[PDB]
Amino acid sequence: GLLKKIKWLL
Ligand SMILES: CCCCCCCCCCCCOP(=O)([O-])OCC[N+](C)(C)C
Ligand SMILES: CCCCCCCCCCCCOP(=O)([O-])OCC[N+](C)(C)C
Ligand SMILES: CCCCCCCCCCCCOP(=O)([O-])OCC[N+](C)(C)C
Ligand SMILES: CCCCCCCCCCCCOP(=O)([O-])OCC[N+](C)(C)C
Ligand SMILES: CCCCCCCCCCCCOP(=O)([O-])OCC[N+](C)(C)C
Ligand SMILES: CCCCCCCCCCCCOP(=O)([O-])OCC[N+](C)(C)C
Ligand SMILES: CCCCCCCCCCCCOP(=O)([O-])OCC[N+](C)(C)C
Ligand SMILES: CCCCCCCCCCCCOP(=O)([O-])OCC[N+](C)(C)C
Ligand SMILES: CCCCCCCCCCCCOP(=O)([O-])OCC[N+](C)(C)C
Ligand SMILES: CCCCCCCCCCCCOP(=O)([O-])OCC[N+](C)(C)C
Ligand SMILES: CCCCCCCCCCCCOP(=O)([O-])OCC[N+](C)(C)C
Ligand SMILES: CCCCCCCCCCCCOP(=O)([O-])OCC[N+](C)(C)C
């Protein structure tokens, strides 16, 4: 999921 990748960046 895309949000999980954002979460990973942040
Ligand atoms: C107006 C604001 C726009 C902000 C845009 C920010 C960039 C977003 C980049 C998102 C990249 C991640 O995509 P993803 O889930 O791996 O893609 C789906 C890939 N498959 C179909 C193979 C599963
Ligand atoms: C309504 C539009 C808002 C736009 C502004 C951006 C807000 C981003 C907030 C993102 C907060 C992180 O959420 P999360 O803990 O992973 O999600 C919990 C729910 N699920 C488990 C189903 C994913
Ligand atoms: C779905 C797209 C998401 C894009 C990413 C958005 C990230 C937004 C992060 C917002 C975090 C808010 O932190 P807060 O509690 O107010 O602390 C901040 C406190 N100071 C100002 C003193 C440093
Ligand atoms: C901002 C933070 C939100 C946190 C909650 C995330 C919940 C994720 C739910 C995921 C399912 C939502 O699929 P939808 O939009 O109906 O798909 C429509 C797709 N097409 C346009 C290709 C048909
Ligand atoms: C308006 C400008 C928009 C620019 C958007 C450019 C696309 C960005 C896609 C970012 C995808 C990041 O997540 P991921 O590939 O799962 O991370 C894997 C881990 N590393 C990042 C350390 C390699
Ligand atoms: C995924 C990494 C990015 C995280 C982005 C965090 C955005 C914070 C927005 C704070 C301002 C809006 O306050 P609220 O309506 O009570 O916010 C509820 C937000 N959460 C569901 C995440 C608790
Ligand atoms: C796939 C989603 C793409 C959209 C992401 C939206 C979030 C805002 C852009 C963040 C992209 C850069 O993050 P990064 O330099 O790796 O982390 C921040 C730097 N530290 C790790 C040192 C804290
Ligand atoms: C609307 C604007 C949306 C912008 C979304 C941008 C998402 C892509 C961020 C790419 C920023 C460049 O990362 P880099 O130095 O090559 O990776 C450093 C990664 N670590 C910190 C984990 C080591
Ligand atoms: C649609 C246009 C939106 C423009 C605004 C985007 C705001 C993005 C705010 C990005 C806030 C950066 O937080 P950060 O230091 O990486 O936090 C996480 C720190 N740790 C990794 C140590 C937990
Ligand atoms: C970009 C900032 C990432 C901060 C990461 C460090 C966590 C501690 C600071 C929490 C600040 C308030 O966060 P909130 O409104 O309850 O959202 C929570 C959304 N995440 C669960 C995805 C973080
Ligand atoms: C090619 C695409 C380019 C996308 C560019 C995305 C930019 C994302 C910005 C991420 C900012 C993360 O802040 P940081 O490293 O933890 O600094 C925080 C340091 N102070 C507390 C002293 C201010
Ligand atoms: C007119 C309305 C104006 C509202 C303006 C709101 C500005 C909020 C600024 C929020 C800056 C985000 O936090 P930061 O410094 O990147 O820390 C990221 C890491 N922590 C969440 C743990 C602190």
Swiss-Prot record:
Annotated effect of mutating residue 9 to A? Decrease in antimicrobial activity, but no change in hemolytic activity
* Compartments where located: Secreted
Q: In which tissues is it expressed?
A: Expressed by the venom gland.
- Leucine amide: residues bearing it: 10
Upon changing residue 10 to A, the result is: Decrease in antimicrobial activity, but no change in hemolytic activity
Q: How is it modified after translation?
A: The C-terminal amidation is crucial for activity, since the carboxylated peptide has antimicrobial and mast cell degranulation activities drastically reduced compared to amidated peptide. However, the carboxylated peptide has no hemolytic activity, like the amidated peptide.
- Source organism, top-level taxon: Eukaryota
Q: How does it assemble?
A: A n-merization is probable.
What this chain does, per the entry, is described as: Antimicrobial peptide that exhibits broad-spectrum antimicrobial activity against both Gram-positive and Gram-negative bacteria. Also shows antifungal activities. Exhibits potent activity in stimulating degranulation from rat peritoneal mast cells but not from RBL-2H3 cells. Has little or no hemolytic activity towards human erythrocytes.
User: What name has this protein been given in UniProt?
Assistant: Anoplin
In its UniProt entry, the species of origin is given as: Anoplius samariensis
